[PDB]
């Protein structure tokens, strides 16, 4: 919110690990949906 809270360095890097785990999970999700789009594009010509 408005007042910035202090976050400890262990807590900051835990938040950063949770963040980078989130976006590597959405990168994995987008990659397997990319595989789904690719299979869909592939079998509409086969």
């Amino acid at each position: 919110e408005a007042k910035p809270k202090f976050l400890s360095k262990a807590e900051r890097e835990a938040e950063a690990l949770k963040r980078r785990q989130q976006e590597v999970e959405e990168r994995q999700r987008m990659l397997e949906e990319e595989r789904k789009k690719r299979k869909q594009f592939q079998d509409l010509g086969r």
């Binding site: 919110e1 202090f6 400890s8």
Partner: protein, 1116 residues
Amino acid sequence: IIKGTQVYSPEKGRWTELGALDILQMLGRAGRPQYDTKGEGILITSHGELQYYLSLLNQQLPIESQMVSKLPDMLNAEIVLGNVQNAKDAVNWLGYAYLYIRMLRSPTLYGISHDDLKGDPLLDQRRLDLVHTAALMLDKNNLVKYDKKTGNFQVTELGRIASHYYITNDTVQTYNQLLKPTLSEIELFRVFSLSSEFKNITVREEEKLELQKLLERVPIPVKESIEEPSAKINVLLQAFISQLKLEGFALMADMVYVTQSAGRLMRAIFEIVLNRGWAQLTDKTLNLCKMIDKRMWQSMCPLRQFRKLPEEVVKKIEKKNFPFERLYDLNHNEIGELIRMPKMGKTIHKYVHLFPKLELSVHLQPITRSTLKVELTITPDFQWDEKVHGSSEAFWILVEDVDSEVILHHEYFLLKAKYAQDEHLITFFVPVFEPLPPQYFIRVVSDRWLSCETQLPVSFRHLILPEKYPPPTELLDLQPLPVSALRNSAFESLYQDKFPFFNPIQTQVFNTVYNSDDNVFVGAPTGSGKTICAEFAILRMLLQSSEGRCVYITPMEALAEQVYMDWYEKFQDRLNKKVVLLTGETSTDLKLLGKGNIIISTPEKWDILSRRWKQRKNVQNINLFVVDEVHLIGGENGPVLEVICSRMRYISSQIERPIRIVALSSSLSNAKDVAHWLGCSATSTFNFHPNVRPVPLELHIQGFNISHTQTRLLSMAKPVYHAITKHSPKKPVIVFVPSRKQTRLTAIDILTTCAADIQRQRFLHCTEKDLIPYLEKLSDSTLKETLLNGVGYLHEGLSPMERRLVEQLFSSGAIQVVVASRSLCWGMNVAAHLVIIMDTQYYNGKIHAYVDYPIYDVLQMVGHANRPLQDDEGRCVIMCQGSKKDFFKKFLYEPLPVESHLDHCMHDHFNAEIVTKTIENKQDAVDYLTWTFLYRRMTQNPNYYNLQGISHRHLSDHLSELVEQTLSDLEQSKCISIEDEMDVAPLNLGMIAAYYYINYTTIELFSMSLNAKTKVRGLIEIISNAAEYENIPIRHHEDNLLRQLAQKVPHKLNNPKFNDPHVKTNLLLQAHLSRMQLSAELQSDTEEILSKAIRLIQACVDVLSSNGWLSPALAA
């Protein structure tokens, strides 16, 4: 026996006769002085050429001037050097030539009739005609801006390039017509080959066959046909660089001629193209300069520029074509087996690590939306060797856009041999345009070495530009405020005879400052009279109750002295309100704050009072806090100003009665942040524009493209006088110069230039009848020498006796020019019509670099061009290096972006708020940091502060990393103690460091570096190693007289490096203790040392007090 007298001269392109010089020297070898009684010189000639050599060798060939051949080029060289300015000075220079004396003695031979010598005996009309004809050749070829009205010359940059590289005026007209940004390498050889140096190169048929054998082998294609001469010059340059063996004598001679011209011609093309900013063509032209010089193509191995290698191993490297940067990562075994030359491998490794290779790192910081500050650190990653590199390696730093077709910033970079193996900080400012580019590129290329280029992409992916700042508040055309709009009669009785109406800034600002009670930000340019807005706030505070208390903070101590002299005459003499000025003693400042109604201060003198504001009631119940020049929050000694204004807002948030802050400043761009940080409204924030000033400033900026700085500083000396004559002939001038020693030299160079002209003593508007009571007071005799001719000067080494008397001679108008040092920009009770700012850089000898002026210094210097009633305008001519030219064309016309530098200067104030128990845990450390300007600027310009966003997560975690880094630095210093990893408490060292205002790392050094057996011999080494002395100045020529001081003083120094500030303060402390004679510039720094010495020694007393050691404490 001189056989033939016929040499093939390629500059005439034909077989011409032997010169007078070569024949006279060949025939000086006739007869040896040991053995021979008689020389015998046979000279076999054509018969028509017999009389020439008979006249030559028998005292009968007259020496006649050939200057009409090259008169526009020599006239351009005198125009470029500034030796001639108008056609009269060019006629004066032509009178010194041999052509003038030969035209006087033999008029008939030089196209003058005796009718014209009888009608012009000194021959001034013929010199005017020659100067006018040569100047028509110069302005036709765009070398000189020459008006036939006044006869004045202006130098063009093509003029500078043609003079610097000797290329003729027709050649620069060719390079002005033909050089486009879009030229390929094919067209570049063609533009070179159309030089007028090769206007006599014709292609003869007897070599055309050989030229075809070159044209099928040269690697850059030629658009011309080979029987056109430009194709011949093209393929001869390319056959030179390719090292093709030629066979015709005429063709080898033409090749040698076109390449010895091609060095200067390609350097002149490179300078034209670099100055216009074309990045692809400046890469091509600088590469072609280095290819003509090194005689190799750039695809060849860079190890051919080391001429000590065998060419067989170099062709083995070029045969095995990997990139040259592959050779860096290999071992000397791995190189030698990659080339299959294991014998040569160690030598190839030595020469690949002798090859110049800079490692660049960029730290970019968005200043405005338009400008970034790139701090490029250059790291030499090559072993220096004097036999291959020499005294220096020259580089070009080219910063260019994504397309690499516009150079946004080029600058020369000398890597000197003393300063290899260490990082060079090159700070510059690049513009950023509205289609925000993905990158800029920094190419640092060698000026001499082929394939020595480091490119660095300054990527703008995660670049958060600051918001386009709100427009400045307009001068609403108020009808000008009579002083009767103030209320009390005693209040007008100190403004009656000064001015009847206030300036429009004060009219607009008056009703909010006087007739309201809000926090007011007044952002107006230096010279708008914002101190009268401070005085409006003070008169309001003295209306509310007469025992009120203003506190007036000026960031410079000389500004505090000047406003104390103003307000002691204004508020104590006429309103009987006590105006006190605080000095650096905490014992008497509490008394002065308790007794005074207007408390003048510096930020560090108010910091030591406000640090204990819970204890001091007189810090709490102040009724008004005026902060003059808060735009100095973005400089050195600027975090302390930010901390005391943040504290004075935080106190006002706690003490039942608000402390009304009135922040005066120069005109800011980000003034909404200073308003939001100091609680000003949107209606009470008067952020004006730099064009709003009561006397309009005419600011001219002169670029001097001279990278060497004594050369630039001496090349500025005649344009200083020419700026005086152009901009203010009969009106006061201040010339601000980089140093204490430059002001005497420039005060003499103005006088030698005004005595070069017939207007000697033109700067003395009074008589020498009137100067003897003021000249007999001075100590500096050369100041009397310069003052009697009308040019005073000012620096730190003068006494305030001499300083105040030169300022009184200048304020009265008796003298016209005052050459003041750069550090006297704040402390001058005088303002001129013209302010010349000569060379806005100064030598920081701690880093051995010419650091630029901070823009607050230049803005105060500019604001010295402000005479309100006497002058209709105020002119300022900033002579600066052309690398710094657009940095001043930004930051002086558009308002000032100020950014807090508190995150680097944090630990002192965090320690001080910890010993106050303001910061009791790390959460309150972030909560205290939210009161600063740093918090307000981290959300508007995040990437200045290594942020990645303005969100609450980014801001909160960056503030938490800031506080947990500074409190780790304070607990590792044992200044504070952190329990539960959250709650901080003051320890002993922190209490000592925040009591007597010492840097935390100084007492980190003290309690680690004082043992139980230290003594005064070592204690001066301890106190001289304090970090309060790292800002002592090391200038040039400061090293060897300190070495002269290292042999005398009663204690020797183990490993003294005279680049150190600390051993300088050690020597100066010892020389003050031995009461030795000093140079004036060194006792100028000794008084800087001894001001902070006594609190350091008391800190030593207290750290040895807590440590329980009797004898070192008594030694302290």
